[PDB]
Design a protein around this nucleic acid. Structure first.
Lengths: 271, 46, 149, 77
RNA sequence: AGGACCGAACCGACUAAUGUCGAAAAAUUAGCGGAUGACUUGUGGCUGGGGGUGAAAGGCCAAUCAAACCGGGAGAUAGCU
RNA sequence: GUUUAUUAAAAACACAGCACUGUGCAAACACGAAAGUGGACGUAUACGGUGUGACGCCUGCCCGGUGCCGGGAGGUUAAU
RNA sequence: CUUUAAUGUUUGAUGUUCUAACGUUGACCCGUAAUCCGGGUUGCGGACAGUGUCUGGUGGGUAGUUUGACUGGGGCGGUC
């Protein structure tokens, strides 16, 4: 649900919250937790490799099952939980044998639902099937690119891909970016689309909302000096230069895709 | 006025102590230069 | 490069002739597979006598043994029962491990790599023709019928 | 290190004269490649880091002779 | 409930005066701003000089920064005093 | 809210929001002669860069020049 | 010689298939109570990619330097 707060005071005026009543109001499953120390954008050398990253509230990593290797074992959905790491919510799944796992929650998933994995599975949302068994023209999420890898495509909230073509041992996928990718058939995918589709409606409201979300202030190149940035300098907001990255690479319409290795799996580019 | 020098025995030893100097070769060269000069206090220590 | 040949190559196979070959081809294929030996003024003398005719029989016997063993099964047919899906959509794709194991259990004694699948990987249920490459010039035809359970 | 395990080739520094004769320090690297050589003595494959020239000498001279020379040199393959 | 309000500790440093061989190599006195947060603080770590860090002032990096400090090339060179 | 510790606390910087653009994940990009790390145990409702700066009404005309993207007849064009 | 057409030859651009080089930040097993690494098995790519030498283009991202004298101060103008 989307609720807009009353303009009680500045900073709360523009906040738009996304309240999810069916979320679990309690501590998560301790056995599946794992510490996640923040890096602040620093790498092993200790230098800032990625800017505008730092701070934020402490958050624990949840071991989410992406491979879904428990084939032929029906499992019930215990509840849904808030995972700070993903944009989408996660679901606690209890298998018939009595083990609990975390999975991405699609739109149609809710407590008390039944899910299954492997070829011997129905077509209900949330089931894990290989594309060869999935009918063409359907919506799937958490797609794999190589068998057993785990799934990398369509993992964010409200994301999905289409089965557009089936060329024998290969399948063509149309991604939310308008990209048509050729993928090997045997590797797995999950039916339905990721839940929490209203992630756009949130606006964070104020400056500090981004601050405790792990994001640091961004400094425009113009405000910088000539030495530290290619932009900057001059009296009175002078630019007179083509936009560029801080390291001289020309941005704003310069393709940086140079792989020559995965191009054989690319059918069409973005448009 | 918080001056620059804020003493701390632990940090002083872990930054300029004997074991810190010997860990890396350059510190080893520093000890060698001190010995050649014949300084009474080779390094910092209690 | 000059190299003496032991096996019969389809294109340049003449059992020990000084035919130029690419160095990479010899290093990657001929040498590891024992189909050739690097002869440079030294192995030539040994080949003229110890291998010019002696090794010919030692090489033909293997071809004869393969020919007799690969006709062990007079029926020349394979039947496997699979729990295929309703109206097609076989349970899961099957490669060569299953058929090779079944053939070994009841049929011809064959290795794993010896099996070749020219027509896909036998996905659709029904009768299919499979070719086995047992020798450089010997081809074997086998009929495989998958029965839905 | 970028050192051939057969011929001992190592990177060698040098200058790159420009059209205006300007000199800048460069470095010529050997054409090293990781290759897997089949040896019948052990009936197994041994991985080596060799250059294009190194692979030629292995191709000409016996693989065993190169290994024996390599063992004498004291380098572990 | 609140980067909500008034206001001590705490953090900050807008105005004036004093002080400029001062008590102090930026302080005191009287007012002033924030004060549940993008807050503040202790301890210990990480980032090393054509580099770091920077809510961006060429600011900060041991009272020194449009390129730190120490030693060396080095008795650099000085058509200048 | 932040800033020129030690003459400038501001109209400057940041800001939520908006737009453009790059990136299909061995991602772009960054630090590294390299390995390897960060990005991220994230994967397009995500991430980087750039500009603008809540919100309201809007954001017009011009592709010559300089960039960027795409095309390809012909010309020119290194090593070899 | 102008003008044609078989077989064999030097072949090179182009396309298809294969795997044994090579890639694998795919899976499984072992060293090994090990997310490194190595080996083995297998899958997927595959003579591409990637790397070395040579070479064209791009290249203030970075570096070393230059940017005259006369002159009723200098600059501008003019002059040599």
């Amino acid at each position: 649900a989307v609720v807009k707060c009353k303009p009680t005071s500045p900073g709360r005026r523009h906040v738009v919250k996304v309240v999810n009543p069916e979320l679990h109001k309690g501590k998560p499953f301790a056995p599946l937790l794992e510490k996640n120390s923040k890096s602040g954008g620093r790498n092993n050398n200790g230098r800032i490799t990625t800017r505008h990253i730092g701070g934020g509230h402490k958050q624990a990593y949840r071991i989410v099952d992406f491979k879904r290797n428990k084939d032929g074992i029906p499992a019930v959905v215990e509840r849904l939980e808030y995972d700070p790491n993903r944009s989408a919510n996660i679901a606690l799944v209890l298998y018939k044998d009595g083990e609990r796992r975390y999975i991405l929650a699609p739109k149609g998933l809710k407590a008390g639902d039944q899910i299954q994995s492997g070829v011997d599975a129905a077509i209900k949302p949330g089931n894990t099937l290989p594309m060869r068994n999935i009918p063409v023209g359907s919506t799937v999420h958490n797609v794999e690119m190589k068998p057993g890898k785990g799934g990398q495509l369509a993992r964010s909230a409200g994301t999905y891909v289409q089965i557009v073509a089936r060329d024998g041992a290969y399948v063509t996928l149309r991604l939310r970016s308008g990209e048509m990718r050729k993928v090997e058939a045997d590797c797995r995918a999950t039916l339905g689309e990721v839940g929490n589709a209203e992630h756009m409606l949130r606006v964070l409201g104020k400056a500090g909302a981004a601050r405790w979300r792990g994001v640091r202030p961004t400094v425009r190149g113009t405000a910088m000096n000539p030495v530290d940035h290619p932009h900057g300098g001059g009296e009175g907001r002078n630019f007179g230069k083509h936009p560029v990255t801080p390291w001289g690479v020309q941005t704003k319409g310069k393709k940086t895709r140079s792989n020559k290795r995965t191009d054989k799996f690319i059918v069409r580019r973005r448009s | 006025m918080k001056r620059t020098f804020q003493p701390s025995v632990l940090k002083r030893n872990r930054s300029h102590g004997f074991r810190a100097r010997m860990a890396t070769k350059n510190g080893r060269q520093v000890l060698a230069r001190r010995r050649a000069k014949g300084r009474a206090r080779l390094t910092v220590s209690k | 490069m000059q190299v003496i040949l032991l096996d019969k190559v389809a294109n340049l196979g003449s059992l020990g002739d000084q035919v130029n070959v690419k160095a990479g081809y010899a290093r990657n294929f001929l040498v590891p597979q024992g189909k050739a030996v690097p002869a440079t003024k030294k192995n030539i003398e040994f080949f003229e006598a110890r291998r010019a005719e002696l090794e010919a029989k030692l090489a033909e016997v293997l071809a004869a043994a393969n020919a007799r063993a690969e006709k062990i099964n007079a029926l020349e047919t394979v039947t496997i029962a699979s729990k295929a899906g309703d109206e097609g959509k076989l349970f899961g794709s099957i490669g060569t491990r299953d058929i090779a194991d079944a053939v070994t259990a009841a049929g011809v004694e064959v290795a794993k790599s010896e099996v070749r699948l020219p027509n896909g990987v036998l996905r659709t249920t029904g009768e299919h023709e499979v070719s086995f490459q047992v020798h450089s010039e010997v081809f074997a035809k086998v009929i495989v019928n998958v029965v839905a359970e | 290190s970028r050192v051939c395990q057969v011929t001992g080739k190592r990177p060698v520094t040098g200058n790159n004269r420009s059209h205006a004769l300007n000199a800048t320090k460069r470095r010529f690297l050997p054409n090293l490649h990781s290759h897997r050589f089949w040896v019948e003595s052990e009936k197994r494959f041994v991985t080596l880091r060799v250059s294009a020239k190194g692979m030629r000498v292995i191709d000409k001279k016996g693989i065993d002779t190169v290994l024996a020379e390599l063992r004498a040199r004291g380098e572990k393959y």
